[PDB]
Amino acid sequence: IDLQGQFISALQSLGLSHDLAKLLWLPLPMLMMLIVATVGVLVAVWLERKISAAVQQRIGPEYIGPLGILAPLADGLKLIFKEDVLPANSDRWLFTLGPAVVVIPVFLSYIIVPFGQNLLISNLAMGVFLWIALSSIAPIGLLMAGYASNNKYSLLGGLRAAAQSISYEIPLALAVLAVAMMSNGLGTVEIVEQQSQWNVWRQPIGFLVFWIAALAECERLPFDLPEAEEELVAGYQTEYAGMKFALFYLGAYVNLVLSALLVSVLYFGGWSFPIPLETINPFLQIAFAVLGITMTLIKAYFFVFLAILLRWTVPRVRIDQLLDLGWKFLLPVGLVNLLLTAGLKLAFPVAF
Amino acid sequence: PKIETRTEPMVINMGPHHPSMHGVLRLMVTLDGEDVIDCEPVIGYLHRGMEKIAENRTNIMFIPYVSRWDYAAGMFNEAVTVNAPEKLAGIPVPKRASYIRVIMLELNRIANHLLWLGPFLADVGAQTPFFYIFREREYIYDLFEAATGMRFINNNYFRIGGVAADLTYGWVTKCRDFCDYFLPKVDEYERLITNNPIFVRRLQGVGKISREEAINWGLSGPMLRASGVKWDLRKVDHYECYDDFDWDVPVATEGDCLARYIVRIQEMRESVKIIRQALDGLPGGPYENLEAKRMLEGAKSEWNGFDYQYIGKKLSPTFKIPKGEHYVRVESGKGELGIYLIGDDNVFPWRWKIRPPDFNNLQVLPQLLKGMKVADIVAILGSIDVIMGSVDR
Amino acid sequence: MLLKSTTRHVHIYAGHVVDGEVHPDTETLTLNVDPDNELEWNEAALAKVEAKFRELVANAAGEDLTEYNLRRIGSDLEHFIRSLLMQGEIGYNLNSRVRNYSLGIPRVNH
Amino acid sequence: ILPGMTVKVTNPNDTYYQFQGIVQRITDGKVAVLFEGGNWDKLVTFQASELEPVV
Amino acid sequence: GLLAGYQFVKDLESAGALALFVPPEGGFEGRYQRRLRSKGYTTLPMSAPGLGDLAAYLTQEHGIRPAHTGKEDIRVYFQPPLVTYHLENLPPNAKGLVLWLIDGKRLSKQEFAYLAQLTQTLPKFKVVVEVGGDRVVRWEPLADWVA
Amino acid sequence: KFLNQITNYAKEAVQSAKYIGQGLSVTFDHMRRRPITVQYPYEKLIPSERFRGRIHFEFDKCIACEVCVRVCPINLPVVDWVFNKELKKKELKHYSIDFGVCIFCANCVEYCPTNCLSVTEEYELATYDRHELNYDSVAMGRIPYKVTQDPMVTPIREFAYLPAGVMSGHDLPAGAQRAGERPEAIANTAKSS
Amino acid sequence: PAILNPIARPEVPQELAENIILTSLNDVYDWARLSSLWPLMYGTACCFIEFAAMIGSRFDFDRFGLVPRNSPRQADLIITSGTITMKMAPALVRLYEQMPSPKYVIAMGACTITGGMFSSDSYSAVRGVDKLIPVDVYLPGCPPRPEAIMDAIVKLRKKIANEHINERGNLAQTHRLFTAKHKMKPVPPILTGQYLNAPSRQAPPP
């Protein structure tokens, strides 16, 4: 229904300087994506907390609210209410700036996830490449948290956070190059409007590549070494007490949600009940919008579910067993996939 | 704020506050670039003074202390503290109370191996088996709470002349149900682990001792038996109700964490093979049939004789243990517990001593870390079934 | 590195508090009587504690700087505080915090 | 029911079914049965309706 | 409910002895204790499973005999009453001294009646008892709930 | 030399994926099995016929034998007597146990001849202060709790009190009994054929 | 010498608040810090094994919001679990004090509120953790039923609700501190590495 048009025209009817009107529509989706991001964090926390109890014949929170619905609310409000402590020789500027640096770009990368056509913020012609770029800023914040702490116990485990995050960006890049072949570019709308009746069937290998490189962004118990609670307590996090630890926590879960939404838009699509949709008009547009949003969230939820379900199925790996995936299983296979897709697009340019 | 790197080996502290279960233990470890040269293990954080408390406390007064050495299994040591003065006085023990002793003590062995298994896997990644053992090890808690009062530890079920209290009515067939429910699940663990590559690649060949190098250092338990040594005090010492059952003492030879794991996991099946074979042979069977057959005719019959009673003459708190020293021992999960008892003439002993297996087994922590890594330490430390409570003497 | 004796309401160190750090110097022996406010202190009894500490370090100490010795000093201070708290100079705080009677419950001295 | 009087339990919905025990104390309708048996003497409060004053 | 004023304080000042039927989670009752402290009342919970005759520990002076462990042969302490000592150690602007009991189920009818009758005598003193129960925090006078 | 390396590589990959999917299916199977959780405050668990919780005490049956102190590992219970002079009787003037020190070995219960001193199923002891655990003679009898008679509890039996073959104690008939016959029933059965 | 160990009779009493918009927000504040207590995995003895069984699936404590946390700084609670010898006590005060200020304590067991069985004839046990830190809830019993720990947490949760927001002045430390020069001849640390690299392990003497 082009809500931008009516918002600007109704607001341009009582004046308000039409350029200013186009300026004043900016913050609405820019904060709506923050709303759904925070909600996705709350949902991811509650989901992990209840499914990690289902796996174990356990029952998660039910005394917080009805079903633990208000558990991360309690967590966040507490961590606001907690004291913050700045240890003895730690720096004052870098300590309270590390978590901001590792948290910000994950939010900033929500300017590309569609949720529906013309239902996103500012489709960039670069798109996913900007995500691959902004994701490489996190190790700076992690090394900042390591250096800005007298805790050798922390820095010894903050360098290995800039060893895996600096290792699973190359195949993460190659698996999306393999999609940039097909889709005439890099914009998400172009990656997905190429699906009108999915890339997973034609990228059976790059799926594993992207999906192993996304889980291994210092997130999950298959690796999550920099928070290896048993190996060395909380790594770089153990001196962060109040809302700063909440920033780290938030950042992990919101990055997981972003990975799920991004696998959805890349390989499956944030539309397309798998029949060739649009074969069957504002009252119909508001229906297909809801349908596309719903199916997007279905696939994102399935990937969040599988991701949390590996956390309780897959014991961790030291650091050498880890880095012998990168450069020895993900990078050669990503190169092979790239060359394969290139050769097939050269021979069979149809279907790509 | 920073730390001023230098070309020297780094010293780090794995302090009392472990994020784990393996007691409270220091390991001042020095490394050469994510290696390990050696480490000074500063144990001592749990010395509360047993061996001098045991000199103003008679037997029945001291027996609840005894179950705090091995916090996991508080009957491999109640049994020893029973057997120590029991041999000097030469008090005959019946077959019923001794079969009960065998059953409960071997059930505690099962519990001990489960509590080894849990944190062994938590320190080596996932936490789910920690939740699958307290889903299963919690049933023998209910068994004990039925027979004795409290659960793992503090039962104080054993006594000098035998056993304190005859069993409950519905204990035996329910223990059979547990015995039958267990074997399908030690296999489900081996479905979830023992071939998962991310697990077995973590502890392929870390740690190793030769046969005769594991005998200087005296690694009395499965560590000594996980290096090619058929030796268990249940068989070589002819512990009380043995040679009456079938036997298959497990042995591995690699000496590494697999050689310990396979031994423990086969032992926790051989134990059930003993238990199922004991319940079918009691002097009296279940207490239901026993008491019924007694009251039916046996106010004098042979179903009220000494060998069918759960204890001989019940003693006073003035038993007055006789003179003469000796060393008793028992093969528990961690290995050989031992007590060097002396006695002079009175209720209070003279130099109560504990010889725990964990102490000698934990001597060789650093040799096993003779240049391995920083992150494969817990895999080795989790191999011994270290219980720092058993290092308070 | 530090060598401290941390009981309840007596914390002794071996450095000099500059602003909140400690900076072990090997000769300053700070003290931190009752940080958690289990007791309500006056100006006199607290000076008596101070003087006890001064005439307990200097008057009887000429041996090594182990934690054993500082722990012994802390024990003597924590018994001196019993004495002050029984005789009735100082008393418990009564505030709506924990109110756990670590030293003793109130008697009447019959 | 009154003190000092041995009783037994008539309640299939109770783990203490068909145990004989001596009454110890009675306050406010609920009576403390004492099960002299085994080794450790156990003490439990039952309602007067769950019981049966056996001889 | 999700928000409640100060009618609990009026009910308590009126009746003298209430009985809370809070849930077995202990998360939604301390706020009313706060509402009492927000007026001037001062609290002391002392966990009834541990109180004796309740005429010797509240009104009169009683003898506590601590734990000897072979050492330090039997000795008394004679702690003073719980209700004529804290009631005199009040601040100046003190409205009264409420009394909280966490586990009231373990006590009996007789001492419920005694605590109720003790509100009228010894004026600046009120009582509350957390007899666990209902899934919504409701209360009732303690003269009621008995006879 | 080189092809065999790639085949072994792919074989290791496939075996790893298979052994991961195995645990995947296992954990996805555990999330239909009913929770064995015991939702305690509303779904409390019933103690056994020998659990050792709080100690009981009668004032009328004691005769001041001092066995309780002479048998406790730490000589805990505070018996206080005065020996009135009618002929010989020790008059019991006070009796307490500090349950912040007591170990619940119940040897006290074991050697009391008068059946005065018993164990109760109270495991819900806790205070904001440890000088309240020192229970007096009139605060040790005190008529225990009896979990089942609680309007807001769904009691559960434990593994020794469930019918034969049964393992959990959650969704049970309202007539279940332990395992087998009592000896009285067996005797009256053998007597009647 | 008339009432020993006395109470102090305070003045300027507390100046509490009374408006509704603040006390409802106080209820939310307390509810939030209440229903998400994050313990510290602090184990020393079988009380920790009962705490581990409390983690388990026969009865968890994940509900009413408890996450076993590994570091003190993120934590909110030390369920003191085991005996406190005289060689680990500073390793407990340095865990308690090295933690954010709105923090609570539970003392499970009898070996850590009076020393329990080791309250007599022992020479290395601390006879009560209440003389190391401010215990907030006591529960007795060597190994207690771990569902009794949840009774203690119920009893602790109905004490977090008993707090007020304009009353955080009773939450800091006053630091009544001094200095004293001395002469006690410092000795070298004999506690280092050097367990196998020491010359005496690679050296049968003459």
Ligand code: SF4
């Ligand atoms: S053992 Fe029994 S009779 Fe003897 S003092 Fe104790 S309670 Fe009294």
Ligand code: SF4
């Ligand atoms: S349970 Fe043990 S410690 Fe407690 S009073 Fe009885 S004998 Fe003494």
Ligand code: SF4
């Ligand atoms: S109180 Fe009991 S369970 Fe706790 S450490 Fe002491 S003996 Fe072990």
